[PDB]
Each structure stands twice: as C-alpha cells, then as structure tokens.
C-alpha cells in the first residue's frame, strides 16, 4: 500500500493550521488526548486546509 505525503504544518497560539495534499481518497482523523477528547474523521478527496 502507498504512503501519503507528510502534510505541511503551520504553528500558532495553541492551534495548528494544516495543509493537506492528497492524490486519492485518504482518511484523516485526529483527537485531543485530554480528559474529554474532541473527535474527528473524514475522507479527504482534494486539496484542503484544516485547523486543529
């Protein structure tokens, strides 16, 4: 199976802006590892821009 490219990170004040460049539908998901996490998962298809 192929491995997708590493996304570009942009640091901020307790925030990360993340650039995504997929070639084909990939699954992107994140969670905050605290007491009460904040879920997410998605099927990225084209170039997007997400803040985490």
């Amino acid at each position: 199976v192929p491995m997708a490219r590493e996304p570009t990170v942009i640091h901020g004040k307790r925030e990360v802006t993340l650039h995504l460049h997929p070639d084909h539908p990939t699954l992107f998901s994140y969670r905050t590892l605290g007491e009460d996490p904040q879920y997410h998962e998605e099927w990225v298809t084209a170039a997007v821009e997400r803040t985490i």
Partner: protein, 438 residues
C-alpha cells in the same frame, strides 16, 4: 530499610526518589515507566457472520400430489404448489395437464468462511493493569515486568520491589463490547435468541464451532411463474454486511487520555491516569558509610539563566567547600523543579553545575548535595517556540513563590492598607478611651 513512595503513571517521566538513612549517606533512585497494559476480563456471548441461503432443487411430482414435511433447520421454509406445467429445453414433461405439484424448500446456514471473518460480542469487567518499569541506582541498570497490584514482589539486585494498586479505577471499555479484527466498538448488541432481521445479529452462534444456530432473516417463498422451474424467493439482506458499512467510528480513535487500543488480547496501552504507590526493601550494600562520603559545608546556590520551557531550560550553579573528592547524591525537595541528574562529581575546586526544568514564573526550592542544603530563587522568562513535539518534563506547577515580584507587590499594597487601618483603629480607640475616662 523499608521505604514507600508514589510515582506518576506517565510514560517516560524521570521520577527520582530520595532515601535518607540516618547512619549512611543519602541515596537517589530513578524509576521510569516504559510500557503499561490495561487488561479487561472478557466473557464471550455469541458470534455473528454473514449467512448463506441453501435452496435445494424443486421436486416436481406430477400426476399425483406431495405433502410438506417439517424439519429442524434454522429458519426453514417449505411450501407445495398446485397447477404447475413446467417446461424444459426439449419440451414439457408431466403429461398430466393440471394435476402437477412442485415442492419448494429453503433454509439458512452459516457461511463457508465464517471461521476467518466474524465479529465477536463480549462482556468486559474488572480490568487488570500490567506494566514494565526501568530502575537504576548506583551502578545497577535493568528493566522488569510487574503486575500493578499489591501482590507481586520482584527482586532487582537484592532489593525487593512491590508496586501497589493503581489510585484510580477508570477503564475505557463499557460493559458491552464488539470486537472485529483489530477494532473495538462500544456497542449494545441484541440478546441471544432475539435478533432482528437486517441489523447486527440477524444470525447468531454461541461459538464458532458450535452446531446450534438461531437465524431470523424473514425468508419467504413465492409461487413460481408459469412454464419455468426456478423456485423464487425473497429475503432481507444480510445484517453483518450492513454493520460493516455503518458501524461508525471506533474506540481506537475515540478513547480518552490518549491510549491506543489493541486486540488479541484486548488491551489499552500507555494510558496515563492515576498514581502508582511503590514499596521498597533495600539491603545494606547499596548505601555508603557517612565517613566515606565527603563533607560539604557552606553550600550556596545561584541561577544563570531560566526559561520555563518543556525541556530542561535552566542552568544552576553550586558553590561549596569540601575536604576530599567523591560522589554525592543530588535531589530537589520540591516538585516545582525537576533536576536532570541524580549524581554529581564533587571536586576540591568547589563549583558544580546542574540542569532543571520549571513551569512557574518564579520558582523556589531547596537542593541538597550529599548532606548540605541550599535555597535557590530565580526569575524565568517565557519561551518563544509555540509548539514542540515532545512531552513536558516538569510537574506543571504554575503558582509563583511568595517572594516573587507579583507577590511582593501584593505584600506591599496589603501592608500599606493594613497600616492605614491600624492607624484608624488606634485613633478611634484613643478617642473612645478619652471619652470614657470623662
């Protein structure tokens, strides 16, 4: 010499323990948690997998009649039809024009590959914690594996270690669990014998090799179309295939405290919560006689730079006066600051350096080199990097010292106001006394 302490259940945290025997020089141990495993206890309920419909060939009994016979098969269905006039490639047999019958038969059965692709329904309770701890002191390295409960003693170089039960009793697994390959789902599955068609658990088996089977898929037969032999039927699609497409999320991407869920066996690893009490029993060979340890007098502490960052962003300098050169044990008696080294090289020059990390604007703590004591105060500026890829190495204590700048200003203002109020009280009391003495 028995001892006890508590260590945080955070992987990679450099915990250091101080032992002060009154007949020997102080000793410092290092304990680090490398790996943990929360192991729940599971009871199997039933096994679900895709089904397969078995439809035998029809038996066209003609110039006569047939009667349906009951059988003990899962979701069995049988009917007899009247008036069929079947056709085949060479022509139509069954001479009798209308006095023919066809018997249809069908039932459900477990699929061929159910023993490679199935979902399990479990009940989880009473998790058991297991850990792997690395300890070093003096010249003794080594890692050990320990059950984290008060009934397992492991000996590491002549020292007996007992790791007590966890402070908290929190588990990420609910009462009911559905396990599929390497994914764990917090799901409420229907009871055995009460499955509904089209959803999860339409067919259930008590075990993968068990002979019994309960299937409810609403299999229904229909009358064949005239002049053909096909045994029509209708059936609600499989519930397992449906569950595969709309199960939704998981526990691997949902668990709190940032701990990965794995399978075979079901466990939750590196899952930081609570405290781990430690009970120890050391022999006399580990300590050093006080005569052999160098004597340290006139210990003073100074700070060069301080930045309360996640990594060790502080430099400390100790000045002293000794008679001989050897090895001391270095420890900090407050959790506001964590030292990087546990032992230092003492020399007749009289200067040693240490590294510490803090999370408060104005830290204040007491540091000991062998038997001497000293008090350190520092002014620390915030760091500039917004985000780092490594965990914090401090205890995350923010409250500044009472001698800090902000607290000093608060003290000054409070003292001024208190002096004003005291003067008010004195004037009022003097006036009242003069009035009463009249």
């Amino acid at each position: 010499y028995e001892h006890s302490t508590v260590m945080p259940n955070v992987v990679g945290f450099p915990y250091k323990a101080h032992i002060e025997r009154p007949g020997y020089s102080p000793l410092t141990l290092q304990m680090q948690v490398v790996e943990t495993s929360l192991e729940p206890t599971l009871n199997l309920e039933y096994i679900t997998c895709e089904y397969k419909t078995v439809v035998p060939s029809p038996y066209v009994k003609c110039c006569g009649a047939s009667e349906c016979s009951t059988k003990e098969k899962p979701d069995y269905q049988c009917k007899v039809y009247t008036g069929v006039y079947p056709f085949m490639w060479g022509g139509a047999y069954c001479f009798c024009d209308s006095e023919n019958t066809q018997l249809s038969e069908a039932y459900v059965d477990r699929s061929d590959v159910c023993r490679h692709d199935h979902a399990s329904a479990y009940k989880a309770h009473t998790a058991s914690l297991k850990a792997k701890v690395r300890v070093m002191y003096g010249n003794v390295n080594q890692t050990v594996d320990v059950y984290v409960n008060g009934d397992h003693a492991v000996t590491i170089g002549g020292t007996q270690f007992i790791f007590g039960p966890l402070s908290s009793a929190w588990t990420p697994f609910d009462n009911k669990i559905v396990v599929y390959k390497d994914e764990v789902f917090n799901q409420d599955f229907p009871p055995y014998g009460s499955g509904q068609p089209g959803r999860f658990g339409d067919i259930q088996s008590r075990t993968v090799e068990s002979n019994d089977l309960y299937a409810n898929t609403a299999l229904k037969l229909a009358r064949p179309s005239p002049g053909m032999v096909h045994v029509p039927y209708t059936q609600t699609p499989s519930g397992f295939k449906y569950w595969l497409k709309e199960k939704g999320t998981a526990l691997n991407t949902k668990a709190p405290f940032g701990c990965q869920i794995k399978t075979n066996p079901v466990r939750a690893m590196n899952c930081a919560v609570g405290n781990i009490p430690v009970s120890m029993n050391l022999p006399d060979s580990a300590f050093t006689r006080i005569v052999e340890a160098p004597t340290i007098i006139d210990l003073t502490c100074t700070v060069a730079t301080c930045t309360h960052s996640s990594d060790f962003g502080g430099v400390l300098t100790l000045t002293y006066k000794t008679d001989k050169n050897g090895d001391c044990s270095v420890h900090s008696h407050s959790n506001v600051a964590t030292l990087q080294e546990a032992t230092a090289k003492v020399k007749t020059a009289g200067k040693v350096t240490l590294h510490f990390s803090t999370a408060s604007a104005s830290p204040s703590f007491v540091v000991s080199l062998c038997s001497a004591r000293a008090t350190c105060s520092a002014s620390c500026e915030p760091p500039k990097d917004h985000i780092v890829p490594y965990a914090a190495s401090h205890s995350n204590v923010v409250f500044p010292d009472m001698s800090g700048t902000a607290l000093s200003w608060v003290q000054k203002i409070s003292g001024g106001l208190g002096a004003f109020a005291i003067g008010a009280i004195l004037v009022l009391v003097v006036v009242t006394c003069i009035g009463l003495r009249r």
